[model samples]
Target: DHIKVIYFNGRGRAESIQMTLVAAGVNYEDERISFQDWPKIKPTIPGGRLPAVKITDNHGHVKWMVESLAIARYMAKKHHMMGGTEEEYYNVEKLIGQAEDLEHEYYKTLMKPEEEKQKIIKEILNGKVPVLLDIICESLKASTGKLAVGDKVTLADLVLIAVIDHVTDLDKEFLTGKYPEIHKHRENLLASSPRLAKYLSD
Candidate 1:
């Protein structure tokens, strides 16, 4: 089957799936639609959103998939990033939801005044992020591998790394001190797949 990811030329909601595809070494079309062309295709979108995935199978059958998490989980399962057991799967889901909550909380400050935005981010980094990281690191300590939920990398691991990576862009030295485990986790997982490394580098 052939695959195409349709979204605006931004990393917002589409990045997780794109990262998974690259990690899995599955080639697909990175179709970015410009704002000028949005309305033309908006009417055809299944979920009334920009980040929809189009799949064309062997029989030339085409299907459009919607929702970022759903699509990422589907790919994650296919690529063995979902873990081995139902309990690990649930743990993964728990971490994924926690990651999204942190991301959303940080993103909501985008519209704040410059100083207020900085304050809010600093608050999130100092306050919310630490507790979250503690939980994640504790999970890693409990697991066989240093991964988030299982012995191998899972979708939750990718989601957590991506969110933290995005937040780190605002504070270059943010992860240098504490939570050394997650910092190490990010490096190991990012290099776990050669294709993912190349994609991130570019």
Candidate 2:
């Protein structure tokens, strides 16, 4: 069996999938498509998207999969990191959706002009972001301040870690001071998960 991941070299949209693969110890070829080379390859992709995965069976049959979140969730589920029970699995899926929502807002902020970015950030801080954090904080608080769900780690934790890392990287003061619950949750994630900690350090 062989798995080939096609994506740009940078840790842009494809990074979380890569992290999931690494965390699962899955052996796969990382076929990075450079920006300069992407123009030539885009037309060949089914949806003209990068971060596609090509899976090959032992007999050499092949299948192509696209979408970063889908790939990551599939991989996580395959590796049993998605969760052990039905409830746990559904919770993991829900968390993934929440994380994607946060990522979408972050991207929207990035698309704003420099002059408008601050205003957008302020709006996010006052509105969407706080709501997102509040939900996460309540979940974590309900879980006794451990992993998102269950006794072991899951894809939900990975997604949450990604969100926390991204938010902190964007604005250290806002993430650290204004969002202390999220900050503490992130710190807990880093303290407990070696793979996630290593990813952050790198």
Off by over 4 Å in 1: 58-60, 111-116
Q: Give the whole-model CA lDDT for all candidates, comma-separated.
A: 0.81, 0.75
Pairs in clash, predicted candidate 1: none
lDDT (Cα, tens digit) per residue for candidate 2, span 109-163: 7756777898877777677876787777776665533677665667777778777
- lDDT, candidate 1, 1-202, per-residue tens: 7999999847578999998888788899988999998989899888789799999999999899999889999999999888789988888888888888778766856768999888887887778776776877776667666677755778987898788876776677876787877887777776666677678779
Tell me model 2's lDDT, rounded to 2 decimals: 0.75
Kindly report which residue stretches of model 2 are placed more than 4 angstroms away from their true locations once superposed: 56-60, 177-181, 188-192
- TM-score for predicted model 2 compared with the true structure: 0.84
